[PDB]
């Protein structure tokens, strides 16, 4: 190895090696130098120069048109940044297209730079140059997840490699990580350094994901001229003949002269004297300014002082100090007056200093003076070379020994440092050439010679960090087995560098016949994984190769902790650990083992050990004790004099944050409250640089040290600083001047009040509702947009953690009017009850920010002990013959015998008429239990009416579909029916039908007037299926109707049997006695008696970002399907209907990653294409074409039918359903995945947990057995919920009543029917409720505190009186102080009629008490509470806003994330006939379903108040049925009548539809040949027009009446989902009087009179006469 230049010159002690600067050699004229005549865009960044150099010339074609990866290798200071700029502009042009700049959320781009200085400089440059495009450039920094999350909301992200690697390792930003499309890697020769492995990790994982998924991510790399560049090219997966570029020194815009000097291998003043001589030569004779590079903040000033002193003596300051008046005066004045940093008074001599320890203003002044020419010699550090654009003619790198504390020794400079330093040599437009000198030793000259002459190979250093990096890939789920590990390792720089030089990497030569070093990659991974197995970071099945990450491995990856350090932490941490032992554990980290104790620093160390508070039991002058006291002294803010000691301390403190956070999370996951809180406090000590015993004001940067000093000289407790004003603040602090200052600081200190509500669920688990209220003024400068907190729940002893979570407080929600947040969790409890628990809310970053709360159990009453389940008797299986009738036995031809649940319940269901309750797991046969009662009922020739009830319309619909087909041909007639919703139509079905299926609300509506309707009294059989769902939402009406049926059979002595079905109950005695069942008729079977046993796997996840968690669960579900149910169907439930499509895509991409795209397809696509063409949703058609398909509420009926056909016939194997249709889903699988147990609720701005009944219902679909005879489920939840959902999946389901929370809406219906005329009537009614029977069993769940009859009666009295008070303060009920009497007003009548909430009713009456206009009723209707039950999808703002700007009527105060605003906008969208996306259109459908009922209610309200504007509201009813405004012309009702056609007809003088049909031309006018041709409609469209125009369009003593007609009541309304009948309103009056007449809702030759103390159609526009 001896390549070099031309000349050597030996001297007394040094050896000058001079390499000539190469000529430009621009003889090849093929160099284009492209003129900036690009398109209008991509020209705005290039403003400072109108021409591109030769390198950007050669790179432009593939950088601006092609998309492939790219590698450029240019000399130092060449102009490579603009190549990356070209690629950025191409990616920009990809998104914004079609003469219009489009959204920036469609793409992101990352720029990876080696050091922070270059990161910030590039942030500035790219921000300035891309600001006209509107895009934001941001630096990824802060080390806090809440600021990095906000930073990742920008497109151009500049970052260091370690920061990007740790961001991707945490995997809590993948939703935006997937948006990146281009990655720029600057100075890739860092791969040779010890930091190269992080770049290898980044590039390998990115390229592997892009190659296995197809989603392209462009990679552009900028590097220097070093050998092995084609190696890093192939590692970057670049085409050599398309995107590889290598430019020699001849392409440098300003050629550099290299000069190497080395002192003889005494005296180190030789380097300083040589620098002084070279300063004399270049600044004196050549008159060139120059900069020198040293590697210390103090050594730079030392060398500058030495040069200036040696120039002072010997009268040599001349030739250096400019002598003109201007430069001298400017230097003198600027230095003496403006600058503040000491040792900077070298400026009057023309000298300048620069390093990171100076002010930003001082550095900018130095930069401006050097650029202006006033500074000739500038001594500086590497931060200048990395972060400023300040070039000089001459650059001297003085010294090559730099201290590395991580290695604890003096090492040589890194190649990237010297290359960046020499990049500043030679000005491009001032001088012809540049000069770069390196001053080193004699034994290190060949190293830098090879470095600068392209002879320093770039070798991989991944092995030293393999075990760690592999672990990361496992924690990400990208490496689950040996083969995936080898696939990952094949995308690293180590792999290609091993393929080229096997002997140099000691492969061992055993792998001679090893293709692609495959056997070398397993042997290299099996070892690494083995280590990970022994440190307990990974679970590694040696045989099957499968690997999985443990929580320790996840913590190690998230915090960049070595496996050795993790081993030490896990082995050393114990729950009783104090601060001393925690510091000792910190000091035993492997990241610091190479730091030795030195006698040179024996004194200071001792001086430091006496000033640090924490005792150091470790032996003095031991490396661990050294770094311990280093951390402590850093926290103590102590100045240090030792240089290497200062470097060691800087290193220790840079690592301290990660190490202490890892310690904290270790203590947290093991559930040790004391040491967890201590470790969190230590994290705060290190990150804020303060002990807990000092003033918390130290956390504020802008707080003057005088105030801190004063406060720490005081004894005032910190809590006494709060709840004051500036006067009292200054008075309390003894310093009036500061009164306003610190008052503004403590007011911004994160403060939170908390409240707790405890509800016992069982004797071993409580449910806690925690209300958190912000009590501090927000400030973005020191808070950001979100503040993180920890919720901890500790024992009475404070020893273990019973619950912990993160609470993220957003700025928008914190400073809101109603800013209260809620958190609902569960904690266990032992039967000897502890006196109390503790709840702490502790800031994650701020010290002394903690709100603590006792949770006392002295008043808590645990519910009654659960009794044993009814045992499953091992009886002889009952044959079907036991039915005693072939008629009934024909109904069950598939099975010879019933299962043991049906045989054990057979006698009491089929041979007796007693009330029965059967509780069994889902999928056990309970429908047969109901059919037993049905068959006995129909055996009796009386054959009374039976009523089946199910909680949801989907369940009654499936039940009807089955029973109307199976149970039709029977003894007499079938006539089984299902109700519709309106009383008059289903009452005829009740009179007509023998078996009436209904929902709780449908049966409620007609069972209210049971006294006047004998058909409700004569009901002999009543089956309440899914009775436990009374605890589900809208389940209180179920409880109401069951209690009312019992009351009915108790009033009328007629016999009435009740049969209840539910899942396995924890408390079945109360439900059984509720329906008056005998002890022997209450079958509450164990939750394990399901005929097909269920294997249940639970998987925990810790990902605070919801889209990231949802993406993270995708591949585990693929693995669960492929391994647990490979050849059997599978169903996967997701939290949202929009999540079904996303999860379908994620699963399909996981299939692509496994090199099997159609893995879940089992039929040729050509056989399925016939049906695939029929699907409406394109995403569903694609997923089905690859064999997945999904199912959600927004799917059309045909799409559901196609999905069901394809799934049942085995064509597709997987099915992804939303949790919103878990009851409707008429499907069955061998495996059921529950991917997530949370859904976002718009009201509370938070995620709610799945009801347990929902998880039971979803796992009840797992009924197809394997050869094992068992079904399989996997439940994927957050970790904090695991023990909850486990608890109530292996134990029965507890059911409580929420009727006490909906008593107003129940009393509305009760009092409206005079069923409750007084408060004692209300108490008597309540006695019939399950709530009442459950007050004695679990009183603390309902707020009751005295279990005696006195306390119970007092509780009921308080409850009914408060409910009647709520209904009386609202203008609904009539009740006063005289007696507890209540009377229903006209409001309660229509409230119970139209089935609207009482809150909606109150706000209706309040906003309508004054006669309002139509534009006001539009705002009032959409504010109803019924619409608040509609889901809000995240990030749908803007769409609603974009369509709200295209809308005539608007509200004064809009809330863009409210259901009110959504309904308000969507109703007007319906009116304007605007296209809507799928989910928004389904929401609009849901709106329109109820808006008509709400409008009729408002009509009745305004008629009750007697105001005229009632006649306005009914007009609204037309507008929604016909989807048009009141201003619009009638002609828009005709089909295919675009407003263009409306104006074409208006030109022909057509205003009404009557004028349209009268002006048709069979024989009327010759306008046909003109009008038809002007309308542009085809004969089919004209026929469809004639259809509507001819077939469906219409044509106090007393008051006379006279009516006539021109029919089918069916209304033609293509835009209204459902059916309507043509009603009419009749009322008249006077306009000036502002009073209305009585109005009667006329039906369809009907003469109706009117008592006087228009004909208003509800669905058409040709409405009224005058
Ligand atoms: N076409 C151009 N016309 C004028 N100046 C240019 C042009 N291209 C680049 N430069 C300037 O050349 C200097 C160096 O280019 P950069 O790409 O920013 O740095 P560099 O090439 O990466 O140097 P290093 O030390 O290797 S990082 C900058 O000051 C640019 O503004
Ligand atoms: N003895 C039996 N042998 C085999 N299959 C049966 C038997 N009894 C019922 N099944 C079937 O097994 C499935 C169980 O569904 P069901 O038990 O009727 O519903 P459920 O478990 O009571 O809960 P629901 O329907 O949500 S109220 C149905 O497909 C039945 O047809
Ligand atoms: N741990 C938490 N504590 C409190 N509120 C939370 C928490 N997680 C989520 N939220 C709330 O739920 C909302 C939705 O959060 P996520 O969808 O998980 O992520 P995100 O914060 O919205 O990030 P974006 O909006 O996608 S950039 C947040 O805006 C919060 O209001
Ligand atoms: Mn660069
Ligand atoms: Mn059932
Ligand atoms: Mn396809």
UniProtKB/TrEMBL annotation:
Superkingdom of the source species: Eukaryota
Record-annotated Helicase ATP-binding domain positions: 61-244, 907-1083
Sorted UniProt keywords: ATP-binding, Helicase, Hydrolase, Metal-binding, Nucleotide-binding, Nucleus, Repeat
Location of this chain's protein in the cell: Nucleus
Coiled-coil region(s): none
Binding site for ADP 2: 149, 806, 808, 1105-1106, 1247, 1434
Residues given in the record as ADP 1 binding sites: 51, 53, 56, 77-81
Enzyme class label: hydrolase
One GO MF term attached to the UniProt entry: RNA helicase activity
Residues that hold Mn(2+) 2 according to the record: 1182, 1186
One GO CC term, this protein: U5 snRNP
Reaction(s) catalysed by this chain's protein: ATP + H2O = ADP + phosphate + H(+)
Helicase C-terminal domain location: 275-487
One GO term (biological process): spliceosomal conformational changes to generate catalytic conformation
Binding site for Mn(2+) 1: 186-187
Chain residues that bind ADP 3: 899, 902, 923-927
EC number: 3.6.4.13
Protein name as annotated: RNA helicase
Part of the intact protein present: 478 to 2183 of 2205
